[PDB]
Amino acid sequence: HKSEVAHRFKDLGEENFKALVLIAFAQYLQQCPFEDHVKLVNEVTEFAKTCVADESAENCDKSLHTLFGDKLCTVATLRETYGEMADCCAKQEPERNECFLQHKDDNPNLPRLVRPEVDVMCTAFHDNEETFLKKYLYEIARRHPYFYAPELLFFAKRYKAAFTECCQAADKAACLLPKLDELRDEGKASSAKQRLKCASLQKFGERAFKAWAVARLSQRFPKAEFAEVSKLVTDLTKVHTECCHGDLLECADDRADLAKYICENQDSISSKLKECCEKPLLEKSHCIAEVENDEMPADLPSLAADFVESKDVCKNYAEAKDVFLGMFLYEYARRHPDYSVVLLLRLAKTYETTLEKCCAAADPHECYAKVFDEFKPLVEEPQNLIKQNCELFEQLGEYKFQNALLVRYTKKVPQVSTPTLVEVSRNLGKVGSKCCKHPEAKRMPCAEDYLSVVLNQLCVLHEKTPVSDRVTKCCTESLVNRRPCFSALEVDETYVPKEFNAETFTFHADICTLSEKERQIKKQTALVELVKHKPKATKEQLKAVMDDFAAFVEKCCKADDKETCFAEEGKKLVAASQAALG
Ligand SMILES: CCCCCCCCCC(=O)O
Ligand SMILES: CCCCCCCCCC(=O)O
Numbered sequence: 172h173k174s175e176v177a178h179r180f181k182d183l184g185e186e187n188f189k190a191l192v193l194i195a196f197a198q199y200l201q202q203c204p205f206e207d208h209v210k211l212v213n214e215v216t217e218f219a220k221t222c223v224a225d226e227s228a229e230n231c232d233k234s235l236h237t238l239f240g241d242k243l244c245t246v247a248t249l250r251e252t253y254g255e256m257a258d259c260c261a262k263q264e265p266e267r268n269e270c271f272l273q274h275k276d277d278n279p280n281l282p283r284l285v286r287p288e289v290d291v292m293c294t295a296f297h298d299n300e301e302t303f304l305k306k307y308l309y310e311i312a313r314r315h316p317y318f319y320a321p322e323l324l325f326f327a328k329r330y331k332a333a334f335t336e337c338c339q340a341a342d343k344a345a346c347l348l349p350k351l352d353e354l355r356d357e358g359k360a361s362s363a364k365q366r367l368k369c370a371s372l373q374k375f376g377e378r379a380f381k382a383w384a385v386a387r388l389s390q391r392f393p394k395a396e397f398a399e400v401s402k403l404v405t406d407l408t409k410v411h412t413e414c415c416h417g418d419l420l421e422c423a424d425d426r427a428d429l430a431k432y433i434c435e436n437q438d439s440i441s442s443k444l445k446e447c448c449e450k451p452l453l454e455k456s457h458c459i460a461e462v463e464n465d466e467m468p469a470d471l472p473s474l475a476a477d478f479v480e481s482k483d484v485c486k487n488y489a490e491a492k493d494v495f496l497g498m499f500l501y502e503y504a505r506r507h508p509d510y511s512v513v514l515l516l517r518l519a520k521t522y523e524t525t526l527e528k529c530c531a532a533a534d535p536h537e538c539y540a541k542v543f544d545e546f547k548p549l550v551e552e553p554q555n556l557i558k559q560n561c562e563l564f565e566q567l568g569e570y571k572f573q574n575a576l577l578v579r580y581t582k583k584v585p586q587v588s589t590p591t592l593v594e595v596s597r598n599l600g601k602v603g604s605k606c607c608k609h610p611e612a613k614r615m616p617c618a619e620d621y622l623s624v625v626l627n628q629l630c631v632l633h634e635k636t637p638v639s640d641r642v643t644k645c646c647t648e649s650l651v652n653r654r655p656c657f658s659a660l661e662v663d664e665t666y667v668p669k670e671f672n673a674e675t676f677t678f679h680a681d682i683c684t685l686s687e688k689e690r691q692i693k694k695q696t697a698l699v700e701l702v703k704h705k706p707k708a709t710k711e712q713l714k715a716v717m718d719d720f721a722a723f724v725e726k727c728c729k730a731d732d733k734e735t736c737f738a739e740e741g742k743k744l745v746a747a748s749q750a751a752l753g
């Protein structure tokens with residue numbers, strides 16, 4: 172066109188336009204004050220309007236990149252607030268922007284964001300909802316500089332809706348709070364999955380990512396043709412590459428184009444792309460990305476036919492080893508939307524391995540014959556894992572469930588810090604409630620989805636401060652094998668118990684007046700230390716100590732005399748127990 176600005180303005184809309192302009196400036200200039208950005212966004216929104224009136228207007232022709240970088244350098248403090256960054260402003264653009272991208276901090280040093288009181292929020296909301304929302308958007312944006320802007324703007328709207336529906340309720344806290352807590356987990360998972368994808372794309376390479384994308388796309392569009400899927404796995408991979416790099420404009424467009432393409436060729440891909448394809452430009456890609464699995468064709472051959480019996484398996488495989496393996500995935504994946512992608516990748520690598528051992532010997536069509544027999548154990552393991560954990564989560568609550576995990580993982584890796592153990596066992600438990608809620612069909616995939624980021628967080632920390640060689644083995648190990656590795660660790664027999672400390676087992680009646688949250692975290696932290704001290708304790712010897720401690724609290728946090736019963740009856744328990752546990 173002529174005016175790239177006008178086009179995007181007209182396209183996006185004043186409302187979404189200003190929101191994104193802010194998020195953008197916020198992600199680059201993570202240090203300037205809110206008041207500073209609003210001024211920028213306004214100066215910018217005013218310009219764009221100029222172009223929407225007359226495209227020939229000065230600069231209305233300039234490239235978005237050029238215009239953007241021009242304003243960033245309009246920041247005087249730049250040199251003292253950012254210093255080195257102010258140096259980028261001295262280059263021709265290809266480099267100037269490339270320069271900017273570099274000085275983007277992934278993990279800056281800002282004060283953790285504290286959640287005000289429901290009523291303080293609801294009032295701020297009502298008084299001036301624009302600057303209240305804009306201000307909070309600016310706070311999130313600057314802390315997560317690589318979060319895909321449009322997706323962030325999409326959470327924003329989900330936030331604006333919780334306050335709208337809740338701030339008008341009798342019990343605003345019972346309404347809002349459980350909503351903010353959810354939005355928080357989702358937003359945190361989302362940012363972790365993005366970061367996780369770029370990490371793997373660089374660590375493991377284009378091949379692995381393409382293999383992942385194939386199995387992934389085959390489950391959703393089981394009707395599209397492998398040629399169609401390859402077309403998409405190719406573009407898709409190009410999209411993450413650019414998005415990961417950091418350029419929002421490039422990333423934004425790449426996503427736009429691929430979304431349009433998918434829509435025009437709807438029929439060739441899936442039947443469920445109905446809604447997503449009618450939605451506006453800003454929601455299309457996101458919608459499609461979340462879309463539901465199209466139904467898998469009823470009449471289709473068997474796999475053993477084309478991949479087990481066939482005496483060409485080796486001829487076609489050697490002709491092009493990757494295109495053939497991708498076919499196996501495409502074929503196996505669209506037949507199993509109930510499998511986790513990592514399970515699929517686990518099979519493809521098992522197939523690839525035997526295919527290499529058999530196409531090089533006597534009579535292969537007989538070497539790789541008992542291959543599907545090798546898949547059984549691989550499949551049965553995660554399945555049984557889900558069954559056993561969802562069946563137990565049904566016997567004990569989410570809390571009494573998390574505790575069981577606590578015991579399990581502390582015995583596996585006692586070395587791990589206690590606050591870390593709790594955080595992890597906590598998260599895992601939550602994964603237990605959102606996934607065990609689906610039928611045997613959507614379980615495995617649900618689990619892998621959450622587990623991935625959870626497990627990755629565990630490694631990200633451990634990375635910073637290693638503590639166990641065992642976690643490091645599983646963590647730096649195969650991404651496809653991370654989970655299995657951990658489920659594999661056995662009770663650490665090496666580990667030498669920690670010296671007793673009653674201070675660590677000194678509870679004061681304050682626990683009587685603590686939110687169910689702090690109450691648990693309190694009892695749960697003790698539980699961890701308890702096992703770190705006596706790791707050979709049984710579930711019997713432990714269910715006992717836990718139950719005794721159970722009634723105990725009811726006896727003093729409800730007695731006319733409090734902190735006494737907590738010091739007299741307590742002295743008795745730490746004693747009875749100390750002995751009960753050899
Ligand atoms: C912002 C990255 C923080 C990582 C935390 C991931 C959220 C845990 C997922 C969940 O249990 O709901
Ligand atoms: C294992 C091959 C690496 C491909 C990267 C896939 C990362 C997706 C992580 C997830 O969301 O679960």
Ligand SMILES: CCCCCCCCCC(=O)O
Binds near residue numbers: 580592629654
């Ligand atoms: C230190 C954190 C403990 C790691 C737990 C990893 C989860 C594996 C799932 C399971 O087998 O239950």
